Amino acid sequence: MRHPLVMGNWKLNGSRHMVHELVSNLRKELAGVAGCAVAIAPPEMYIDMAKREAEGSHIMLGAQNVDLNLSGAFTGETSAAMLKDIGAQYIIIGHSERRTYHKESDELIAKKFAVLKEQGLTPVLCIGETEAENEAGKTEEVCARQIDAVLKTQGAAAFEGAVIAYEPVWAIGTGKSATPAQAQAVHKFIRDHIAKVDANIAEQVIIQYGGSVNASNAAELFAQPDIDGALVGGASLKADAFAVIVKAAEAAKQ
Amino acid sequence: MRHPLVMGNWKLNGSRHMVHELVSNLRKELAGVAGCAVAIAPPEMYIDMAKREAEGSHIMLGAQNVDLNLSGAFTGETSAAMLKDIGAQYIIIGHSERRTYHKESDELIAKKFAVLKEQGLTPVLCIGETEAENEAGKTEEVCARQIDAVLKTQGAAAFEGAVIAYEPVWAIGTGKSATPAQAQAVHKFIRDHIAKVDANIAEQVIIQYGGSVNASNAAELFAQPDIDGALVGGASLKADAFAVIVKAAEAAKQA
Ligand SMILES: [Cl-]
């Protein structure tokens, strides 16, 4: 029985005003929630402020990316040691926006995963297939490759305490939609793939859905046995909507 | 005359403890400075804390990079609107570490310059030639090309109130250093290049030296007429050393 995790990826959205309002409203909307863990990833300059504002709540912090070095002559980079130092626990790596827009390779993302692991932070490893890969029936091949970049170079124990987020990139448009059954099939495949190396590790990995989640499909999605929560995008910017998703995850896994 | 600017590029160095200690020590060491402007660029997650620690001093804040979007579905990016909101003013763009390790193009860097000007922020445009380029006699061609990415798309007016930092990249990990005379010749070339388009704008541009600057060598660099300060790396992590540099710039440019 895995404790669910709902994480808000704020993407490139935030301000001093917005952080104060949204974190305060999240605390209020999440009052009484005990059965679903909650994390947020504001833009990096606001992590400190958000952590301090989250004091008194159960909201955990996180970040949207990390680089490979801990310190040194690396102007503009993000250090895992510094993310740990300001209080970010859940660090998104390999998001589709970075694999695409920033050409981040599977191997680079696996290096990120390793640095996070060495610092004692929790990677949120994003994986998923494109429109063409999905059409060609390559969903499993792609997800296995993206996972193997870590599994084959770092061992199954690399996944102890880790999170994977499955992004059905192929379903981004309003023309295509992933059903809970389709999502479940991919999550089961992911878990089964790790289980071939270590069944115990596979059992404890948190596999979040990273496709669009709303109040009308959350119950069904979270009703699936291998779906352990969600990495939420736009809905994370509105406290009421985000809390509905968190409560649905709590209700489903109780 | 041009009022000098000494800016500390902390690079990938910082922690809450380090920020508090360093900013406190900088406040003390720089409290008596009048004739040199000072900025610091901590790692992005520490800008807010550093800005709050600097309140009450003349230390200005800055950042080490920016991306192109103000907001939206751009996981992991840095927004100029957010840098403005948290209090950063001097934004380093095109640093040699980013042109090399992150393959940032002249054109990308010029787009970053434009977004910063749209937000009322001050670009610190880094330019400079590699070991191979220096060996090939292309110092001027390279600097001209990197500057032209902005000048030929946004005009000389884009350089109002802006800063340029010249990095002799050929001096990094080669065990060599540019002499003050060599640095001065490059700075005068950069200024003359902009002057071909607008002499007035060229006279007011702050052109910082971005090679290695140390408490020991700051005076000899700041004695040069077209060197208006420095973008300091390692010495920026020790308040005593950084203050010696600031004071050297103040003394060199003082009435
Ligand atoms: Cl110090």
Side-chain angles (χ1 to χ4, degrees):
Chain A
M1 293 174 181
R2 288 175 295 271
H3 189 87
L5 176 68
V6 170
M7 180 166 187
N9 178 9
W10 295 10
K11 307 187 178 182
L12 195 65
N13 297 280
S15 65
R16 175 182 35 260
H17 187 270
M18 175 280 204
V19 165
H20 175 81
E21 293 292 321
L22 179 54
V23 176
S24 175
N25 290 154
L26 285 165
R27 194 194 83 264
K28 293 177 185 179
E29 295 284 344
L30 294 171
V33 169
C36 183
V38 173
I40 58 172
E44 178 177 319
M45 67 276 293
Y46 297 114
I47 296 166
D48 187 24
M49 179 186 181
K51 183 76 174 60
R52 296 181 184 279
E53 299 280 341
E55 291 172 9
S57 78
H58 304 117
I59 299 161
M60 304 182 283
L61 264 291
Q64 297 174 23
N65 183 45
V66 70
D67 292 298
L68 304 184
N69 301 291
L70 301 177
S71 66
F74 305 106
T75 298
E77 294 189 10
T78 301
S79 164
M82 298 180 202
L83 290 177
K84 183 181 184 178
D85 180 74
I86 60 179
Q89 180 66 40
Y90 292 89
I91 315 305
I92 301 165
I93 55 170
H95 195 275
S96 58
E97 290 156 7
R98 299 205 64 84
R99 291 180 182 266
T100 305
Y101 310 152
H102 299 278
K103 303 180 184 175
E104 297 190 356
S105 71
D106 300 331
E107 296 72 25
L108 172 66
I109 291 161
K111 300 185 194 81
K112 293 175 189 289
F113 192 112
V115 180
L116 292 172
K117 194 63 169 185
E118 184 274 334
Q119 287 295 300
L121 295 175
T122 301
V124 175
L125 173 64
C126 298
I127 70 177
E129 87 283 22
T130 63
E131 182 185 320
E133 291 163 345
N134 176 271
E135 291 291 331
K138 305 207 311 171
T139 302
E140 294 187 348
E141 162 186 284
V142 171
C143 288
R145 172 171 40 78
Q146 294 171 327
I147 294 161
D148 281 346
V150 172
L151 193 52
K152 291 192 172 190
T153 64
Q154 300 173 42
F159 287 93
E160 194 165 37
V163 177
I164 296 171
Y166 169 60
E167 300 183 75
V169 172
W170 60 271
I172 191 72
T174 55
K176 285 286 176 60
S177 184
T179 65
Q182 286 172 321
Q184 167 58 29
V186 179
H187 286 228
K188 181 185 185 62
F189 169 80
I190 293 167
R191 199 181 304 280
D192 285 344
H193 184 76
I194 298 171
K196 290 174 180 183
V197 182
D198 189 301
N200 174 265
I201 289 290
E203 289 182 352
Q204 61 79 66
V205 179
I206 298 298
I207 312 178
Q208 296 179 312
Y209 181 69
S212 210
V213 176
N214 61 25
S216 198
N217 69 354
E220 183 42 64
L221 279 171
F222 305 146
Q224 301 301 320
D226 295 281
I227 302 186
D228 302 312
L231 181 60
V232 183
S236 72
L237 307 175
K238 295 176 186 179
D240 51 0
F242 186 75
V244 168
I245 297 170
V246 172
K247 292 177 183 180
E250 176 178 49
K253 305 304 186 183
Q254 284 180 348
Chain B
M1 305 302 294
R2 292 178 293 275
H3 187 83
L5 173 69
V6 169
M7 181 167 183
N9 178 8
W10 295 10
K11 307 189 176 183
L12 195 69
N13 295 279
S15 67
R16 280 177 294 100
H17 176 267
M18 174 281 204
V19 168
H20 173 71
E21 183 181 27
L22 181 54
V23 177
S24 295
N25 289 343
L26 286 167
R27 288 173 63 110
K28 183 174 182 186
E29 296 268 0
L30 299 174
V33 171
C36 182
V38 175
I40 57 172
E44 183 174 316
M45 67 278 287
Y46 299 116
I47 297 166
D48 184 22
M49 183 187 174
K51 184 65 168 58
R52 297 181 181 276
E53 294 274 341
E55 280 297 336
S57 77
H58 297 150
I59 299 165
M60 299 179 289
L61 262 289
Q64 292 175 27
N65 185 42
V66 70
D67 293 297
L68 299 184
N69 301 297
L70 298 182
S71 65
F74 306 107
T75 298
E77 295 190 13
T78 300
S79 162
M82 297 180 203
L83 289 176
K84 180 187 190 161
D85 177 68
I86 63 180
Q89 181 65 39
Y90 293 87
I91 316 306
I92 302 167
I93 57 172
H95 191 279
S96 64
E97 290 156 7
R98 299 206 66 85
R99 292 180 184 263
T100 308
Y101 301 136
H102 300 279
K103 310 178 187 173
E104 297 189 9
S105 71
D106 296 338
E107 296 70 30
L108 173 59
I109 293 159
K111 285 172 178 295
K112 292 180 180 196
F113 191 114
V115 173
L116 291 173
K117 296 301 298 294
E118 291 167 348
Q119 291 298 307
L121 299 174
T122 305
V124 179
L125 177 61
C126 298
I127 70 178
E129 87 284 19
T130 62
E131 175 176 16
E133 292 161 347
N134 179 266
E135 289 295 329
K138 297 183 182 297
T139 302
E140 295 184 352
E141 173 188 333
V142 169
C143 286
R145 172 169 44 72
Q146 295 173 327
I147 293 166
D148 282 344
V150 175
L151 205 51
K152 292 188 176 293
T153 60
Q154 298 170 50
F159 290 90
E160 188 172 33
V163 178
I164 294 167
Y166 168 62
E167 297 185 77
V169 179
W170 57 270
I172 303 173
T174 51
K176 318 169 74 293
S177 61
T179 62
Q182 286 175 316
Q184 163 59 29
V186 177
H187 283 232
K188 189 173 181 306
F189 170 80
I190 293 165
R191 198 178 305 281
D192 284 345
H193 184 72
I194 295 166
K196 290 172 175 181
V197 186
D198 184 327
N200 185 44
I201 289 283
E203 70 171 347
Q204 63 79 70
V205 172
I206 298 302
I207 313 177
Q208 295 181 316
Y209 180 68
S212 186
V213 181
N214 46 62
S216 177
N217 82 335
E220 64 176 29
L221 284 163
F222 301 148
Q224 300 298 326
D226 292 281
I227 300 184
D228 302 315
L231 182 60
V232 184
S236 75
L237 307 176
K238 292 283 181 57
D240 56 355
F242 187 75
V244 168
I245 299 166
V246 174
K247 292 178 195 173
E250 174 179 50
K253 305 304 182 184
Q254 213 166 237

